[PDB]
Every structure is written in C-alpha cells, then in structure tokens.
A paper describes a structure:
The cryo-EM structure of cA4-bound Cat1 shows that the complex assembles into filamentous structures, forming intricate higher-order networks. To our surprise, we observed that the trigonal filament assembly further associates with more Cat1 filaments generating a pentameric assembly. In the cryo-EM 3D classification, we observed two distinct classes, one corresponds to the trigonal filament bundle, described previously, and the other where five trigonal filament bundles join to form a large pentameric assembly. The inter-repeat unit interaction between β1β2- loop on both sides of a dimeric CARF domain of a Cat1 dimer and the TIR domain of the adjacent Cat1 dimer, enables the assembly extension and provides an opportunity to form an even larger filament network. As the filament network spreads, flexibility results in broken densities (marked as “1” in black dashed lines), preventing model building for these segments. The tilt of the third Cat1 dimer around the center of the repeat unit of the trigonal filament bundle shifts the TIR domain, which points opposite to the trigonal filament assembly, above the plane with respect to the of rest of the Cat1 dimeric units of the pentameric assembly (see magenta arrow implying shift above the plane). The above-mentioned shift of the TIR domain mediates its interaction with the Cat1 dimer of the next turn and results in the generation of a closely packed spiral bundle without pitch and with a large pentagonal pore at the center. In contrast to other CARF effectors, however, the cA4 binding pocket is formed by not one but two CARF dimers, where the bottom CARF-dimer forms the base of the pocket and the top CARF dimer caps the ligand. Cryo-EM analysis of the purified proteins in the presence of cA4 demonstrated the disruption of higher order filament assembly for both mutants at 165,000 magnification, with only small filament fragments remaining. This result further supports the idea that the linear, trigonal and pentagonal filament bundles of Cat1 are not independent units, but part of the same filament network, and hence cannot be investigated on their own. In addition to the distinctive arrangement of sensor and catalytic domains, the higher-order networks formed by inter-filament association are unique to Cat1.
Residue numbers in the entry:
A (entry chain p), B (entry chain Y), C (entry chain Z), D (entry chain B), E (entry chain A), F (entry chain s), ...: 2 to 33, 42 to 258
Amino acid sequence: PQAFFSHNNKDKKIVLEVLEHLRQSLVATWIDSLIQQIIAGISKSQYFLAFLSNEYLKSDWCWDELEQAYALHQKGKVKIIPILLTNRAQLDLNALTDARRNFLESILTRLKYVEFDPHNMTRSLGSVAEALWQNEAVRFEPIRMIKVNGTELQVVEFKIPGSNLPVDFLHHWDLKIEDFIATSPNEQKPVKFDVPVALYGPGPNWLYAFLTLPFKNRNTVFVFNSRTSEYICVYSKSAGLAPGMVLKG
Amino acid sequence: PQAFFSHNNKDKKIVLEVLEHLRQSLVATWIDSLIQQIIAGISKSQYFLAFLSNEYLKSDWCWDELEQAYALHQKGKVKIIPILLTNRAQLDLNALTDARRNFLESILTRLKYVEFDPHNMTRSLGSVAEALWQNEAVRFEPIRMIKVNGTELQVVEFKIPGSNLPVDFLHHWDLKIEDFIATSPNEQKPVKFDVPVALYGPGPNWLYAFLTLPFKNRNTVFVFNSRTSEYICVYSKSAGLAPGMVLKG
Amino acid sequence: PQAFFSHNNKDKKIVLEVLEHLRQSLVATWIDSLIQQIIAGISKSQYFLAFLSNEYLKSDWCWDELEQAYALHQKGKVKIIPILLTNRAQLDLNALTDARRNFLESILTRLKYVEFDPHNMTRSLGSVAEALWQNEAVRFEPIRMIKVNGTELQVVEFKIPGSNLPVDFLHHWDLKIEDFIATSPNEQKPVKFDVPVALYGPGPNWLYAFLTLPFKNRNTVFVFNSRTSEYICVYSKSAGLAPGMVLKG
Amino acid sequence: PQAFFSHNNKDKKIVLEVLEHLRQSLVATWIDSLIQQIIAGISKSQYFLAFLSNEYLKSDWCWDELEQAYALHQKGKVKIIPILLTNRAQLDLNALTDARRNFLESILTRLKYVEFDPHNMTRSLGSVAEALWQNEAVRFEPIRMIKVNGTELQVVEFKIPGSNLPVDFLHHWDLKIEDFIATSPNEQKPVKFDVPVALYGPGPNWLYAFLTLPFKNRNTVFVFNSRTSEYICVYSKSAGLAPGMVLKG
Amino acid sequence: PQAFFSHNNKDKKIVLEVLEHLRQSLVATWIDSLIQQIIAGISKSQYFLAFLSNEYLKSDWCWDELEQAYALHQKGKVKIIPILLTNRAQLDLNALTDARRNFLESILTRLKYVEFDPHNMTRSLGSVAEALWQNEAVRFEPIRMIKVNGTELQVVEFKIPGSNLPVDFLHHWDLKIEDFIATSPNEQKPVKFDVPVALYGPGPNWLYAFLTLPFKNRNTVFVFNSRTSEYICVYSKSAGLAPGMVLKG
Amino acid sequence: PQAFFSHNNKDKKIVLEVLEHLRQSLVATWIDSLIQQIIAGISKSQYFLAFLSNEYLKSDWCWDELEQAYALHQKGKVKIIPILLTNRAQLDLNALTDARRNFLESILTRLKYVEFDPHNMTRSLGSVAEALWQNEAVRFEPIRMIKVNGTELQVVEFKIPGSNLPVDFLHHWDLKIEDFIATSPNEQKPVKFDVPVALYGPGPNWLYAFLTLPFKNRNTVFVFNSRTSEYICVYSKSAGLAPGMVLKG
Amino acid sequence: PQAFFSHNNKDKKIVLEVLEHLRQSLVATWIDSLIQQIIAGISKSQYFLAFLSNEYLKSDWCWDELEQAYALHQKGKVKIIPILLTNRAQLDLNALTDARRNFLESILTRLKYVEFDPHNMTRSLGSVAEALWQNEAVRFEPIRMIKVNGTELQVVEFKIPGSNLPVDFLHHWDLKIEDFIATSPNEQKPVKFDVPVALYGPGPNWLYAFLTLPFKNRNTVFVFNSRTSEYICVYSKSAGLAPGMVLKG
RNA sequence: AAAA
RNA sequence: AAAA
RNA sequence: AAAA
RNA sequence: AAAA
RNA sequence: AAAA
C-alpha cells in the first residue's frame, strides 16, 4: 500500500522518522503535488496522513489540501488518517474561522484520529502503524535485522487478520516488492542489498510463492516452517549458503 | 524603562537574545559610553545589567565601568542587576586582587544576583526579566504574535503589582511607546508595523487611555473586556477591519 | 447621531438655540433638502423634529415634507419627534383640511409629542433633549466649561441606561467625533480649539479608548477615576500639561 | 419595582414629591407613553398609579389610558393602585357618564384604594409605599443620611415580611442597583455620589452579597452585624476609609 | 498571609509543590533577599519556612539567614516553623560546631517543628497547612473544582477556629484576594481565570461581603446558604448563567 | 474648480465683485463663448452660476444659453447653480410664456437655488461659496491679508469635509496653483506678488507638499503645525526670511 | 551634516568606499586643506573621521593635523569620531613618543571610537553611520532603488530619534538637498538624475515640505502616507505620470 | 443579620 | 534472457 | 470610571 | 496638521 | 497444499 504525507514545514524532524518507520513496514511512501496522485492505481489507493498540528492549521496551503483530501475521501478512493502531533485538548481551535472550525470538529469525531507524543515514540509509532493496518489485509511488521546461528538475515514477518483471505486477493493487491530492494549498500531501502531475506508468519502456499519469486538474482531467500520451527534456505545467491540448510530458531 | 548592558565581547553571542527578549518586554536598551548616560531623564533612570563572567572580570576596562556604576548606585541613581553567565562556584575569584576581590563579593551578597544557564533558556530569561520587573511598577510581558478567529494581531500584556497604582503614576513614567512601533516591515521593533495591536490585562481606565492614544495613525488597536472575555476594536486603520468588531477568545 | 429640523421661518429665532444646545450635546444637526438625506448611513439615521406651530401648519411646502417623513417613518427607517411651539389646546386645527386634521391627530396621539414654552427654557430644552435619547443607547450631556485647580477644562459626560451594552455595539454607532472638534477658535463646534477635554461618567474600558483616541494631535484629554474621584491627564499637547497630572473633582 | 405614574397636569406639584419619595425607596419611577411600556421586563412589571382627582376624570385622554391599563390588568400582567387626591365622598361621579361612572365604581370597590390628603404628608406617603409593598417581596426603606462617629453614611435599610424567601428569588428580581447610583454630585439618585452606603436589616447572607457587589469602584460599602449591633467597613474607596473600621450604630 | 521560603537547591525539587499546594490555600508565597523583606506590612507579617535538611545544615550562607530570622523572631515580628525533610533521628548533628549545635537544638525544643516525608505526601502536606493555620485566623482549605449539576465551579473553603471573630478583625487582614485571581487561562493562580467561584462555609455576613466584593468583573460568584444547602448565584459575568439559580447538593 | 458666469449687463456692477470673491477662494473664473467651453478638461469641469435677474429674463440671448446648459447638465457634465438677484416672490414669471415659465419652475423647484440680497452682502457671498463647495472635495477659503509678528503673510486655509480624501485624489484635481499667482504686483491674482504664503488646515502630508511645490522660485512658503500652533518657514526667497523661523500666529 | 576625512594614502582603498556609502546617506564629504575649513558654516560644523591605522600613526604631517582638530574640539566647534582601521589590541603604541603616546591614550579613552574591519563590510559601515548620527538630528538612511509595480523609484528613508524635533530646528539644519542632485546620468550623486525620489519615514508636515521644494524642475517627488501605506505622486517631471497614482506596497 |  |  |  |  |  502506498501512502501520502501532508505536513507543515516546522515538522521535518518528526515526519521522516515516522516516514522511515513506515518504509521498513513495506509501506510505499511519497512525501514530495499530492491531490492528482490520489487518482492512481487501484481503489485501495492510499491513506492521507494529515500531520495535524497547531502550526499546520495556520497554513492555508496546508488547509486546502486537507479540503480536497476529504472532498474525494467521501467518494471512497481514500481514507484520511490525521495524526495529532499534540494532544487534542490544546489544539488551538479559536484561531480558525467558524467554517474551518466546524469542518475540523466534524472529521475529528466521526473519523478515528491518532495522537502522537514524542516522549514515548514506541507506542506512538505503533499506534500509527496499527491505524494504518486496521482496515487492511495481511499486515507487515517492520524488517528486523537479526542474527541466527552465526549468520545474518533480515526477516519479513506478515500477519493475516482473521484466518482466511479471498482466493483472488493477489489480483487487487498493490504491493509489488522489487522496488523495496536496495540496489547498492549505501542506498536506504526496506530490504538491505545482498543481505539474506527470511519470510515469517503462517499463510497459504500461494502467498509464500508470490513473495520469494521476485527475489531471484537479488537475495538469498529463507522460509520458516512451523513443523520444526526453523528457517529453510531455498535460494543460494551468495557463497557459503546452500539451498536447503537449516537455521535453528 | 531603559537598560544599559555592560559586557565583554566574548559573551557577545548571548547578550543579543537577552536584550531581544527584553525589548519585546517593552524595555528600552542601550548597548552602544554608559556612565554619563546614567544621568539622564528621571531618578528612575535604568538598571545596570552587569554580565559577570570569568573572562569578563579579566578586563581592566570592563572593571572600572562597574566601579563607577556601583559608586553612583549607592546614591540610588541606578540599581545593578548582576548576571552570572558562569555559576558563582566556579567564578575565578583568585585572579583578582584583594581590593578587587573584596569589592566583588560585597555586591554579590548584599545585592541579589541572577544565575544564568544557556541550557535552561526559557526559565533563565524569565529570571532576568523577573529581576527587572521585581522593583518596578506594572509589568510588561513579551509581545505574543497570535492570530484569533482568522485575524492576526500582536498582544500587549501588563501585570500590576498589588491592586492599585499612584494617581500621578503616569507623571513619573518614562515608557513613551512611539519609540517601540515599527515603521518598516524589515526593521525590527517590539510593535510590528501595521500589525493590529491588542491590549490585555486588568488596569485602570486612565492607564488604558494613555496606551491606545499614541497608536493613532499607526496601527489598529484592540481592547479586552472581561464582561464577555472577548476582544473589541477601537481603531480601524486597515481595510477589512471595523471599529467595534468582536473576536472570540 | 444626526438630526433633521422641520420649522417655519418665523420659528427661526428658536431652532438655532435648540440646534446649538443639541450641538453642545454632541448631536450632529442638519438644518440646511431633507427627504433624500433621510436614506443615508445606517438604520439609526436621525430623529425628525416636527416644530409644530400655528403658522407651520399654514405652509403647503411644510406640510408635504412631514407627510413623506411619516411615510418613511412607518418603514421604521426614521422616527419623528413632534415639538409643540404652542400648546396643543391653542393649535389651529380648524383651518386645516379634513385629511390634514386626521393626519395631524394620528401622529399627535399615537406618537408622543414634546411641549415647548419660551418661558421655561431649561426644562423645555431638556425635554427636547430627553425625547432624543429616550429610545437611544448611552446618553450624552452638554459640554461644560469648568475650571478646576485653576486649570480650564471641558467635560463630555455620558450616562449609560441599564449599565450594559452590546459587545458589538460600536459597530452600529453613527458619530465621528472629529467633526465636533473646532479647527479654529472662531469656528462654532461642541469642542473648542486647543481646549483640553475631560471624560466623565461610568463606562467600559473600550468606550473610553474609542472616544479619546481620535483626540491625538488635537486636544489634551482628561479622564475620571471613580476610585479616587478626580481627573487624570493622559495626553501632553499643551504647554505645562504633562501626561499624568491629577486635578481634584 | 418599576412604577408608571398617571396624573393630570393640575396635580403636577404633588406627583413629583410623591415620585421623589418613592425614588428614595429604590422604586423605579417612570413619568415620561405609558401603555406600550407595560409590555416590558417580567410579569412583575410595575404598579400603575391612578392619581384620581376631580380634574383628572374630566380629561378624555387620561381616562382612556386608565381603561387600557385596567383592561390588560384583568389579565394579571399589571396591577393598578388608585391614589385619591381628593376624598372619595366629594369625587365628581355625576360629571362622569354612566359607563364611565360604572367603570370607576367597579374598580373603586373590587380593588383596594389609598386615600391622599395634603395636610398629612407623613402618613399619606407611608400608605403609598405600603400599598405598593403589601403584595410584594422583600421591602426596603427610604435612604437616611445619618452620621455615626462623625462618618457620613446612607443606610439602605430593608425588611423581610415573613422571614422566608424562595431560594431562586434573585432569578426574577428586576432590581438593578446600578441605575440608582449617582454619577455626579448634582445627579438626582437614591444613592449619592461618593457617599458611603450602609446595609441594614436581617436577611440571608447571599442577599447582602448581591447588593454590595455592584458598589465596587462606586461607593464605600458598610454592613450591619447584630452580634455587636455595629457597622463594618468592607470596601475602601474614599480617603482614610480603611476596610474594617467599626462604627457604633 | 505571606510565606518566606529558605532552602537548599537539592531540595528545590520538593519545595515547590509545598509552595504550590500552599498557593492553592490562598496563602501568599515569596521564594525569590528575605531578611529585609521581613519588616513589611503588619505585625502578622508572614511565617518563616525553614526546610531543615541534612544538606541544609552544611551551608554557611543558608545557616546565617536562620540566625537573623530567629533573632528578630524573638522580637515577635515573625514566627518560624521548621520543616524536617529527613526525620529528626538521622540529622547530622555531629558536623556542626558546638555553637551551631546548641543553636539548632534550642529552636527544636521550645519551638514546635513539623515532621515531613515524601511517601505519605497527603498527610505531610496537611501537617504543614495545620501548622500555618494553627495560630492564624479563619482557615482556607485549597481551592477545589467541582462540577455540580453540569456547571463547572470552584469552591473557596474557609473554616473558623473556635466560633467567633473580633469585630475589628478585617482591619489587620493581609489577604486581599485580588493577588490570587488569574488574568489568563494559561497563567497559574489560586483562582482560575473566568471560572465561576463559590464561597462555602459558615461565617458572619460581613466576612462573606468582603470576599465577593473584589470579584466584580473578574469571576462569577456563588454563595452557599445552609438553610437549604445549595449555591446561590449573585454575579453574572459568564454567558448562560444568571444571578438566582440553585445548584442542588 | 472652474466657474462660468452667465448674466446680464444690468448686474455687471455686482457680478465681478462676486467673481473677485470667488477668485479669492482660489476658484478659476471665466467671464468673457461658454457653451462650447463647457466640454473641457474633466467631468468636474465647473458649476454654471446662472445669475437669475428680472432683466436677464428679458434678454432672449441669455435664455438660450441656459437651455443647452440645462441639457448638458442632465448627462452630468455640469451642474447649474442659479443665483437670484431678486427674491422668488417678485420674479417676473408672468411675462414669460408658458414654455419658459414651465422651464424655470422645473429648475427652481427640483434644483437648489441661491438667494442673493445686496444688503446682506457678507452672508450672500458665503452662501455662494457654500453652494459651490457643497458638492466638492476639500474647500478653499478666501485668502486674507494677515500680519503677525511684524511679518506680512498671505494665508491659504482649507477645510476637509469629513476629514477623509480618496487616496488617488490628486489625479482628478483640476486645480493648478501656477495660474493663480501674480507675475507683477499690479496684476490682479488671488496670490500677491512676492508676498510670503502660508498653508493652514489639517490634512495629509502629501496634500501639503502638493500645494507648496509649485511655489519654488515664486514665493516664500509657510506652514502651520498644530503641535505648537506656530507658522513654520520652509522657503528662503525674500531677504531676511530664513527657512526655520517660528511665527506665533 | 558635513564631513571631513583624515586618512593615510595607503588606506585610500577603504576610505573612498566609506565615503561612497556616507555620501549615499546624504552627507556631504570633503576629502580633498582641512584645518581652516573648520571655521565655516554653523557650530554643527562636521564630524572628524580620523581613520586611525598603524601607518597613520607613523606620519608626522598626518599627526599634527589631528592635534589641531582635537585642540579646537575643546572649544566645541567639532567632535572627533575615530575609526580604528585595525584593532586596538595590537596598535603600535610603543613606537610613538611619550607625549604622542599619552595624547593617543587620552583621546581613545575619553571619547567613543569606532572599530573597522575588512571581513565585515556591513556592520562596519553601519556602525560608522550609527556613531555618525548618534549626537545628531533625524537620521538619513542610504538611498535605495526600489521598483514598485513596474515603476523604478529611489527611496530616501529618514527616521527621527525620540519622538519630536525643536520647532525652529530647521534654522540650524545643514542638509541643503540641492547639493546632492545629479544633473547628468553619468556623474555620481546621492540622488540619481531624472529618477523619481520617494520620501519615506514618519515626521512633521513642515519637515516633509522642506525636502520637496528643492526638487521642483529637478525630479519627480513621491510621498509615503501611512494611512493606507502607499506612495503618492505630487510632482510630474517625467512623461507617463501625472501627480496622483498609487504605488501599492 | 455568626452560612436567615 | 528484467543485473543468469 | 481599577478589564463596566 | 508628528506619516490625515 | 492456510507456515506439510
């Protein structure tokens, strides 16, 4: 799923680490218009991340985007997730005009908002991630760079809400993965360059085949089997790795 | 009230934000002598801001000015507010001569000093302002650049010690306000050019009359009435503003 | 507020004295058409003074002016205050036509009239003034040339019926105090030229701010503080009058 | 309570001194229409005063005013009290028409009247106040200029008929003290300007607080305590009047 | 009443809440010389707050302050209360010299101290209040905000030691309330800005009048009557409320 | 503004003295066609002074000039001010035919006329100027021969009706000073040759600069400042007249 | 004001650019004797710009010039402003003779001097102008060329120290504008030839007048009015403009 | 009239 | 065979 | 009239 | 009329 | 064959 970030200029510091955190969660991002890019791809387009803040509301340029963002939000192409950088109590509602105020208090109630606090980032980041995935198909936890039995790998863990997926789910998905693979060691990407990749999480056989398949000629692939709770190598794109060696988890 | 700033050029990096914050507090400053300018105006001349530091006391010129400043301070013409850039414990007291040392500790104990800390910026500047307003009449908080109900205005805050003021207090005041009004947008002044000016805080009616009058032909003036706790416009020097419109606060 | 005077040339001896007393009461006066001047300004345009007299009812030009005034009075844009030059008993009703008698009786009975007698100037002038402010907001009193502490002053006394005013009340006031200030000693104006002006009577802070603000560069202003019950100087334009003098009252 | 005075110009000498007497009893008095002023305020609007006299009944304009007042008085919105300038025996009933005589005879019997005699001013004035206050709430007394211990005070003495009030009495109490205070020494008001006021009469604590509160910045306030039967200064406005002095009254 | 705080900066963290709790008790607080500030106002000047701590007893600068504080306490100008941050058993009495030691034990026995602890903070806070209010007049329990019947309000609790007060008690009271009313919502003070205030507690009528009177144009005032036990509105400064409503307990 | 005079030779003795008075008011005059001179310059070209006189009604050549002037007035190019040499009652309307008697009554009733009596010469001149400046912008008063402090000075006084001017006013102001100045002492002009001039009357600074500017190398200029109310010399042209002298007018 | 320059020929590179900026601030300079030129004009002769440098102290012909300037400075004809080309710390005081050295340490201490350094042109040039007008009347900021709405324009910005000027201040003023007007584009002058000049900065009307007259037949004049904050044209010396358009800021 |  |  |  |  |  791709995402759009609308935020005020005073908050570069508090945006990218949210921006980056979503990137390691394999969520496509585009920071910098945003309105015409809404009409792109599938009906499951994207979620508007309105980084609501006191100084954000004093920018009319920021306000008009949120106006058009909600204007086509009702028609169903997008749902807006407004993250309050500050607590709802001390949002300065008096400065806005009555039309602006009534428009703000509308969406804040009938549509669920997420509060953000820089002091406790861990629960703050998770709240946005949970809000992002709340109305979604199979989840995607951030990539963990872990070490097992002396070898290094990055694990891609995905959680399936409920138990079953639609049989034709892959037709409507929008998470082609090959653009998340780093091409150079210095390049920052969710998947490190030439680092072994492991898939974790229970799921159907077609889901697993759909994920490792684009990894050919890119990275060694590891698969986790619950029968013995271990990782299994399927692709050997680097020396010292054989297809089928086992790592004890 | 005017203020004279005595300092050495090594601590230049910190003095401007001290006086810049002080200038928004409707406090006149005079950095660049200071001795002969003491004898000017009313017996409520000024306060001597001696920015005491280890390198400050190492300069013979920086010492003699304080000597004369204290010499006529005993006559009561001026009071000195000592600012310690470095905490008193690590002050290089040994480098001074015995006559120099005995003089320095004399003012330090019998006269209250203000401890300064670059890290705790907000509280430290408040303490300096507090000492300035400690022995003064009605206070003057720094100008807050606020916007309320779609219109942007600069507010003026004043706090009165006790409950009452002398009837002839305006006779002995030295705070003419036409020297704090900006003439051009680029040059800095406590009162921004053409920006609506607001008066807040309880006070006598004659105090209000003395303040709004010099703003004629300069800026739109706003007054706060506690009966409805809202703002009232008295002067309309700009388009789109009518005398008597009410701002919700 | 402005006022339109309807009178016959034999009553010219008395209208100007009424006009002057109304002028000294800070009421704008318009003597010399009047019909099209009615539709100008806001809904609180003026109050029509019908100086009813025996000869006034004998003029065809004077009759039709009243009729159109009443025609617009029904609309509520203007109202007519009938001032009786002679007593109602001795009014020449027989000479008038049947329509004129009925029209005169309709306005004299359904709308309260004012009885005027040359013998009692003080009460008659006050009743004329009282009828002007009965349905009006905060009251104005004639300017008084009063000398206190050996210093000459003029007073602008305003009385508030009900001790409460609308918050946006000034938005609907029709009076520019500048036009009442004389630009020359020979000019006839409610406020004399270079004579200090004093404000008296209870009122909100914003009313005091609005009233004395246009006085800048025109006259020195004084206000009343009921806490100590004496006048205080707030403006220094004349020689020897610093801002802050206190004059007992 | 408000009061509307209906009288003939022959009794003009007597009504104002009756009007002035009721004014000192903190009764709002309106002399100068009267019909459309009935529809204003609360159900306890006012008490119509019919100054019945031989000449008064001889005027058609005055007669129809009483007819309208009684006609809507049967609705209970207002009550009329007849004050007889002449005694009932010598009233000119024969001059009245049969409908007028029956109408006057109807009201004079079913509704209680008050007799007025010029020689007995002291008794007659008390009866007028008693009739207004026989069917009314907490009663006041006319203001007395008394001097205790060399201090001038104006006692506002009040009485409670029954020593029991509704707990929400102040909700419908249409008595605003602000309008009864003098803004100038020459102003005719029940409360004189700058003269300290004194509260007398047993009652609930909150009743006092409602009365003294508007006096802030207006007059020095005194309150009577029955524990020592002595007065207490609670406001310090005039010179030398500290809040807390004791007067043996 | 006023209070002066002398302490060491390692105890600066814990002192403020005691001061902040004390401020809520409508008790004037002065933290930051002090020795010359003792001679001010009436003989009931303040109470000295000696926060005795093991760190405190090692400061020569802090010790000598206690000397003149105790010295003029013998004259009866001020009475000192010692607050022991640590329990008396573990005070480092061995560090002090003999002369300093005999000084400290002397003031500990003949003068009542208070025992303090940070675990049982509530009782510890109450004990300090009791010591201050033991020798004082009618008490003042800290302001509490209670939402009764859907309207927010604050209660000013006052309790009278014994049963009565001197008739001239108001003269020497140093508790003018205006020093405790906030002017802005953000700035902290015992009385919140624009919040309705209520007076609850038995007392004489003049005491009630003296309290609500300074609140005009500041906050809405409520008075408690024990006859039926609700709050009675006397002042109406906020929209939606009128003087006369009742708040059932 | 321009002025075109239409009159008969019988009133030539009085026409030029009215023209001279209007010339002294800085009004441009053209005496001796006029019909084709109407279409010249700007829309606010001039005002037709129709000197209505009985003999003028007997000269058909004068009649036809009025006919087109009315016709061109109807489109708004010019406005006619009819001046009555004789009063309305004695006007010879009977000798005029039906078409002409209907012609004049339309102007006399629908358009305001000016009454002129040679006896009240001063009032007549004022009414002529008053009508001329009634529909105009800032007015120009007659220039007086005033001596102050031993200096001969010609003062130019103006008055702003309403004390407000369009900001772009100078673009459409058809008032050039250069043609009102005298080249030789014997030449008749509103401005005397080589006599120093002054500016008086409140107004914007750009208005003052515009009026004095054409005086370079022409006359010595003075200005009036209301701060001290003394004339200020700004031009050093005549001998002994330095720029900067103070003239106590 | 006037200006005399004292410098050494090695520092020719810097002085003329200091002169160039000072000339742009409308100060006439005289670089190339100087001693006899002091007795010329008024008591406010000029400010002696002593460009102190290491080599300047090494020229005997340059030194005695300073002594005569200083010696006559005691008479108050001129005040000397010393500019330090190099810092005071490494000034070659040892090379100078005892009399010469003592003369230098005299002037350097009792009169304020100016430090100048290459690396910062802007502060160095501003500080020179700052001390240039520290003891002088209304300041004249350097001429700046600003094109507004497509119209090229040069602005002369002047600011008044304090709030008021002496009424006869123009008598002693030494800023004859005609000496700063260019006659040809090629030559350099503070005012560009044929380029319109705009007047900016609050001030009295007469001061505004004093500057515009010397511009007639020379350059187009513009005046900034703060009522609406644009520039108003009063003189038309160039085609395409006639006095009166508005240049919105 | 010291929560009337 | 889209870095085999 | 000391945020009426 | 001291940026009206 | 939905971590076989």
